[PDB]
Amino acid sequence: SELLVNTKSGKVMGTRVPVLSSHISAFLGIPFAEPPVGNMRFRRPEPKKPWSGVWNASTYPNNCQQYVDEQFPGFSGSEMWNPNREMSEDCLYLNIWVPSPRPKSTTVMVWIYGGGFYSGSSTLDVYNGKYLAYTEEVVLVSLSYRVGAFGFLALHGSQEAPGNVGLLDQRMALQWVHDNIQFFGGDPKTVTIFGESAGGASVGMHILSPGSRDLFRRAILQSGSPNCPWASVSVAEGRRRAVELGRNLNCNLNSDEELIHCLREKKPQELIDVEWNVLPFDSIFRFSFVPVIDGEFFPTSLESMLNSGNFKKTQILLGVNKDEGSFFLLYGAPGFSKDSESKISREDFMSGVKLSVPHANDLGLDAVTLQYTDWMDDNNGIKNRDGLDDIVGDHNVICPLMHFVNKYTKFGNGTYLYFFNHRASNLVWPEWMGVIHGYEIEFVFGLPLVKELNYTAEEEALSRRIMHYWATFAKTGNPNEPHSQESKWPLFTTKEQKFIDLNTEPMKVHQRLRVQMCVFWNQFLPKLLNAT
Amino acid sequence: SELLVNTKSGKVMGTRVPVLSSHISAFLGIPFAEPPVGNMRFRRPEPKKPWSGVWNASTYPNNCQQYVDEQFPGFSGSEMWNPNREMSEDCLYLNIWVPSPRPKSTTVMVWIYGGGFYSGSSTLDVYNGKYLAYTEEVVLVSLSYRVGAFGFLALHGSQEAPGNVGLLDQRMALQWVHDNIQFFGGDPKTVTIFGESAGGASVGMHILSPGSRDLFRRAILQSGSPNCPWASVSVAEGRRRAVELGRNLNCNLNSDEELIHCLREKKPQELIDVEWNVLPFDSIFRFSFVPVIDGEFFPTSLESMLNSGNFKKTQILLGVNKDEGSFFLLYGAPGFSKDSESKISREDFMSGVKLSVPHANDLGLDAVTLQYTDWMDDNNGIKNRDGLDDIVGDHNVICPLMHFVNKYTKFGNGTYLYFFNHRASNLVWPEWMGVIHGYEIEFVFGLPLVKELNYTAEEEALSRRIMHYWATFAKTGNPNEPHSQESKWPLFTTKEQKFIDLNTEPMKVHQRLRVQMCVFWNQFLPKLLNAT
Ligand SMILES: COc1ccc2c3c1O[C@H]1C[C@@H](O)C=C[C@@]31CCN(CCCCCCN1C(=O)c3ccccc3S1(=O)=O)C2
Ligand SMILES: COc1ccc2c3c1O[C@H]1C[C@@H](O)C=C[C@@]31CCN(CCCCCCN1C(=O)c3ccccc3S1(=O)=O)C2
Ligand SMILES: *[C@@H]1O[C@H](CO)[C@@H](O[C@@H]2O[C@H](CO)[C@@H](O)[C@H](O)[C@H]2NC(C)=O)[C@H](O)[C@H]1NC(C)=O
Ligand SMILES: *[C@@H]1O[C@H](CO)[C@@H](O[C@@H]2O[C@H](CO)[C@@H](O)[C@H](O)[C@H]2NC(C)=O)[C@H](O)[C@H]1NC(C)=O
Ligand SMILES: *[C@@H]1O[C@H](CO)[C@@H](O)[C@H](O)[C@H]1NC(C)=O
Ligand SMILES: *[C@@H]1O[C@H](CO)[C@@H](O)[C@H](O)[C@H]1NC(C)=O
């Protein structure tokens, strides 16, 4: 039967799922690691022991333990990101959508969800892989990994809580895909990993880490880069935060052993309840437990790895959204609200800048403010609001990606860059937030092809184009259809630095995406902060 | 007779001079101080002893000893600034143009020439006061003062060479005007001092200095401000330069007495020949001997005087030209030439920045470069050339004047600000230099009314308008004709910061002249340089 697949780990039984008037097979909740529970909490993952009999893979698995957004109860804009299955530490599973009839050896795409490294689920409606698998005829896999303290608590020097275990969870899933996807009709030689935000940072981290490079062929990064200021911490900062978490739970702090044992006796929600108390600064776009530059998963500093070409050389397709910072200003910066136009006073602007670049001294804060203030009209509320939106997006997402892009292209084998700037007609968030962080995902996953979701005919066309760009790239290392008549997405080169806009209008090519601001963020400001 | 005037210093005999088909009286070369020669070189000026008989004031006097421009022999663009009379240390004289018939008590305007404090003459053709005196019916005076080491060599603590004596020369001339102008038909209660560049800085210095304030009524500053970075030095830097001058002439440096005596035995040209060797940095727009913050002529730092309102409160009219920096880039920055379009490479741009802000550390240089580089088109030669032109003009002239303007207006009784941006049709300098430092002077002095000088009919109209604005302001403290139908030059206020463009097009009002760049130069950069 089509729904029965024998893998190196044992037999698995899937389910037939309807998709746009047709059908495909889905193998949901396949285990790829032993549950990281009890004494294994904080530890590197262990491979799942093979099983006898047939594993029932007809339903989604549990989501990993995580902080749950309750800022807007019942609001779909925020709840579409919350776990939609019961949470459990026993959450290391992957999902596979397979075209029907089962292919023999086709293109494989593995999705890595985002969520600031503290949240996320592979089972969200926006990550439903059936549309992409069906429309592009690819085997679509979505993995999972531990987030928050469970996946990133780091006490460097200890083997009980070394840090980066969430990344190792992702690596283990990629190993399982490499070893077994052939049985589902996928070609292990042609695996593209793709993810957004923390998932995009993760993809870049696998490109960098020597121990992950051989597990995939190509990569797609959406609104995320390994060098993002929020994506990693030093082992000293990781240690300080782990100790501070312990201090919040009245743990014995005499030794790592004492600390870890105490943290292991706590129920999941006890760690989550105090997780946010360990941040070193009053800030926005900063998360507690994230990857650590350990000297193992990451051999040396990310910057030196990027500068020396110490990373997997292959093709990459990546990009950013127009208003990456709005989600974060709404949730923490003074003056912003979901139900107002959020025009920002000069003082709230100043407060926002301080929260946005928490690590900056006063000279640094002045540099940023000057760079984003129109002094001919400084009390303009809309300009202050949009300026902050740009500060947050440029600093945390766009400029780090542009730095990654330029460093990468020097050694890589092919780069395609995009600027997604279409605001969905059915967006439930207010207009001031614009093209929000995370909102290109629904187009990548084909949601607009579903009539009941209320997208326009051009948005469905945009979705189909993006899906075919992503899949063709996964398949060939080039998003363009060979011998096609359609407009060509040009290669991003060190010299011309071309990129295309991604929206419902006829393709348009540009060059040097936000160079003015990124020279400020990537070259000048760090020089200023390092000198003063 | 109309050409005979009895003053408190003795009788003076002038000459009748033709002016635009009519005539007026001119009293040229009237002495206002004893010749500052021999043992009086470097000393404060002494008032001229009264004379018996009649002083022949029919011809221009000698010009003060100064460096002479030989960069373009025979070229009128540069030679129109060079002394046009024999040079001599016996050069403290003033000139007066009086309408005919002699008025009884009319508006007085006293001109203070510029020249970077190291050069300048009251006898230049562009400073001919007959047109303005005739057309506006004002008594026009042009004074003179020692420049270079002769007027500004400063060994603070010494009475033989205290510094600032060139400013005291100007003050003595203003005292003579106050005491005697009534005999020429001028009203001592209504004296307006006006000057350009170093002369404009001088005017602002008299506004600041307690010992000069009572000598005039109102002020006009053209492309110059007392706080300009090149207009003054500390007593320590003044001393170092004086000692270095001595070192260049093989002087005994054991004491001030030994140094000064040696400097006094040298012929004028010997000091001038090594004058430029004392600058502390490789730079442009920096001059050797300038005013010193001595604690006497200037009670405290210029900034604290400006901040506390420690200055004469009255009305001021001032402004800048569009391309203040071009003259200086042509003469010293790599890549610029008089006969080429001077498109600047990225490297010459960098070299220019270093010469333009000689006091800046590397972080400072990077800040400036970033602020003026279009990173989307950084190898554009015209943009690099124009960017440097703006760097030089903003830093040395425009932003210091804007800082002066805003500090002044808070305590003053009326401010009128202009932006002169008309390029004369008959300019002999190349097009790339634009509206050059010093080139609004010919319009202020009415040269365009002289047919043989080849100006257009609209330029003559512009000249007449400017002359009437200046004179009406001198007379009333307001450039606008009361009850006129013409467009009104609005008052510059702390709140609205309005200014007008000055050109052949219908008046246009704007606000916050070059605010973006001036916040950089007046607030951010000094904060950066002071911290790092
Ligand atoms: C690094 O990028 C991200 C960081 C956080 C999240 C996402 C994300 O990318 C997006 C798209 C996708 O990748 C998944 C989740 C998304 C959207 C949903 N949500 C958006 C709200 C994030 C901003 C508020 C975060 N919070 C705090 O900073 C904070 C501080 C103290 C206590 C509680 C909180 S919080 O959870 O409200 C969480
Ligand atoms: C502070 O503003 C200024 C500084 C210098 C001058 C003027 C001026 O404003 C204008 C208009 C008016 O006020 C009178 C003279 C003006 C035009 C004529 N000339 C223009 C040429 C100035 C630029 C070159 C100065 N030189 C040097 O920096 C240098 C260095 C070493 C040796 C020799 C020289 S230099 O004389 O060629 C001299
Ligand atoms: C990606 O790598 C391939 C193979 O290494 C590059 O193709 C080679 O290009 C070189 C230089 O032009 C030729 O000498 C070889 O014959 C090519 N090999 C093959 C098998 O095609 C390709 O140019 C690279 N692409 C980019 C954008 O770097
Ligand atoms: C310049 O100073 C004059 C006189 O000090 C100001 O005129 C006075 O304005 C105050 C306040 O409006 C009135 O109470 C007086 O009656 C006015 N005095 C006279 C004699 O007019 C004038 O407003 C000031 N101008 C500016 C721009 O500051
Ligand atoms: C597979 O497991 C799910 C768990 O709820 C169950 O509903 C479904 O009927 C099961 N099917 C088989 C054949 O075990
Ligand atoms: C005034 O002095 C000048 C000096 O050259 C002379 O030419 C002129 O004739 C003199 N006039 C009288 C009356 O002395």
Please identify every residue of B annotated as catalytic: 197, 324, 437
Ligand 1 proximity of A116 Cβ (cutoff 6 Å): yes
Q: Please give the full DSSP string across A132-176, using - where no structure is assigned.
A: HHHHHT-EEEE-----HHHHH---TT-SSS-S-HHHHHHHHHHHH
Q: Cα–Cα distance between B62 and B29 in angstroms, integer?
A: 8
Residue A296 distance to chain B (closest CA, Å) = 35
Q: Cα–Cα distance between B85 and B60 in angstroms, integer?
A: 8
Q: Element (H or E) spanning B517, and its range? A: helix B515-519
Residue indicated by tokens 């312990």:
A246
Going from the Cα of B209 to the center of ligand 5, the distance in angstroms, rounded, reads: 94
Q: Which residues of B are less than 8 Å from A370 in CB distance?
A: 519-520, 524
CA distances from A202 to A113, A227, B206 (A): 9, 10, 66
Residue indicated by tokens 């005076």:
B141
> Is the CB of residue A455 less than 8 Å from the CB of residue A425?
yes
Q: Which residues of B are less than 8 Å from A527 in CB distance?
A: 363, 366
Q: Cα–Cα distance between B292 and B295 in angstroms, integer?
A: 9
Strand order across the beta sheet in which A54-56 lies: A4-7, A10-13, A54-56
Q: What is the dihedral of CA A206, A210, A216, A218, to 10 degrees?
A: 70
Residue B524 distance to chain A (closest CA, Å) = 7
Going from the Cα of B413 to the center of ligand 4, the distance in angstroms, rounded, reads: 8
Name the amino acid, one letter, at A321.
N
Contact B366 A516 (CB under 8 A): no
- Which ligand sits nearest to residue B478's alpha carbon? 4
Q: Please give the full DSSP string across A235-248, using - where no structure is assigned.
A: HHHHHHHHHHHHHH
Which runs of consecutive H residues, i.e. helices, occur in B302-344? 302-308, 326-332
Sign, Cα dihedral of B181, B185, B186, B188 = positive
Q: Cα–Cα distance between A45 and A215 in angstroms, integer?
A: 17
Q: Cα–Cα distance between B442 and B125 in angstroms, integer?
A: 9
> Is the CB of residue B468 less than 8 Å from the CB of residue B317?
no
3 state SS of A312: coil
Q: Cα–Cα distance between A33 and B269 in angstroms, integer?
A: 91
Strand order across the beta sheet in which B139-142 lies: B15-19, B22-31, B93-98, B139-142, B106-112, B186-196, B218-222, B315-321, B414-420, B498-502, B509-511
Q: Cα–Cα distance between A365 and B213 in angstroms, integer?
A: 41
The alpha carbon of B320 is separated from its chain's Cα centroid by a whole number of angstroms, namely: 12
The alpha carbon of A66 is separated from its chain's Cα centroid by a whole number of angstroms, namely: 16
CB atoms within 10 A of CB B53: 8
Q: Which of B263, B250, B258 is nearest to B289 (CA)?
A: B263
Which backbone phi and psi does A348 adopt, to 5 degrees?
A: -65, -30
> Is the CB of residue A303 less than 8 Å from the CB of residue A260?
no
Going from the Cα of B197 to the center of ligand 2, the distance in angstroms, rounded, reads: 10
> Is the CB of residue A356 less than 8 Å from the CB of residue A285?
yes
Helices B346-356/B381-393 angle, 10° precision: 0
To one decimal, the resolution in angstroms is 2.2
Q: Which residues of A are less than 8 Å from B519 in CB distance?
A: 370, 375
For chain B, how many residues are written?
532
Interface test with A, best of B362, B369, B376 (most A CBs within 10 A): B376
> Is the CB of residue B178 less than 8 Å from the CB of residue B192?
no
Residue B279 distance to chain A (closest CA, Å) = 28
Which backbone phi and psi does A47 adopt, to 5 degrees?
A: -60, 150
> Is the CB of residue B29 less than 8 Å from the CB of residue B57?
yes
- Which residues are bridge partners to A5 per DSSP? A12
Contact B527 A366 (CB under 8 A): yes
B19 CB-side CA count, 13 A: 24
Q: Cα–Cα distance between B433 and B340 in angstroms, integer?
A: 11
3 state SS of A323: strand
Write down the CATH superfamily of domain A1-532.
Alpha/Beta hydrolase fold, catalytic domain (3.40.50.1820)
- Ligand 3 residue neighbourhood (C-beta within 6 Å): A 413-414
Contacts of B107 (CB under 8 A, 6+ apart): B136, B137, B138, B139, B186, B187, B190, B192, B471, B474, B475
CA distances from A52 to A8, A26, A173, B86 (A): 11, 21, 20, 112
CB atoms within 10 A of CB A331: 14
The experimental method is X-ray
Q: Cα–Cα distance between B470 and B318 in angstroms, integer?
A: 10
> Is the CB of residue B353 less than 8 Å from the CB of residue B369?
yes
Pairing of strands B93-98, B315-321: unpaired
Ligand 1 proximity of A437 Cβ (cutoff 6 Å): yes
CA distances from A194 to A94, A143, A204, A475, B7 (A): 14, 11, 9, 13, 93
CB atoms within 10 A of CB B303: 13
Please identify every residue of A annotated as catalytic: 197, 324, 437
Residue indicated by tokens 């502390």:
B280
Domain ranges for chain B? 1-532
Q: Which of B203, B197, B51, B172 is nearest to B116 (CA)?
A: B197
B371 exposed, middle or buried (CB, 10 Å; 0-12, 13-18, 19+)?
buried
> Is the CB of residue A504 less than 8 Å from the CB of residue A466?
no
For the record, the structure tokens of A178 come out as 């490499």
Q: Which of A370, A363, A282, A392 is nearest to A529 (CA)?
A: A363
Which runs of consecutive H residues, i.e. helices, occur in B394-456? 399-409, 441-444
For chain A, how many residues are written?
532
Q: Which residue of B has its CA nearest to A510?
A: B376
- Which ligand sits nearest to residue B414's alpha carbon? 4
Name the amino acid, one letter, at A230.
W
Residue indicated by tokens 């190196």:
A8
Name the amino acid, one letter, at A512.
R
- Which ligand sits nearest to residue A28's alpha carbon? 5
3 state SS of B15: strand
Q: Please give the full DSSP string across A328-360, using - where no structure is assigned.
A: HHHHHSTT--TTS--PPPHHHHHHHHHHHSTT-
Q: Which of B20, B178, B186 is nearest to B102 (CA)?
A: B186
Strand order across the beta sheet in which A106-112 lies: A15-19, A22-31, A93-98, A139-142, A106-112, A186-196, A218-222, A315-321, A414-420, A498-502, A509-511
Residue A497 distance to chain B (closest CA, Å) = 11
Q: Which of A59, A65, A8 is nearest to A32 (CA)?
A: A8
Compute chain A's Rg from CA coordinates.
Answer: 22
Nearest-5° angle of CA B55, CA B61, CA B67? Answer: 155
> Is the CB of residue B117 less than 8 Å from the CB of residue B231?
yes
Ligand 4 proximity of B414 Cβ (cutoff 6 Å): yes
Residue indicated by tokens 């990009």:
A319
Sign, Cα dihedral of B278, B281, B285, B291 = negative
- Which residues are bridge partners to B447 per DSSP? none
Going from the Cα of B314 to the center of ligand 4, the distance in angstroms, rounded, reads: 12
Contacts of B530 (CB under 8 A, 6+ apart): none
Whose Cα sits closest to atom 9 in ligand 6?
A: B58
3 state SS of B183: helix
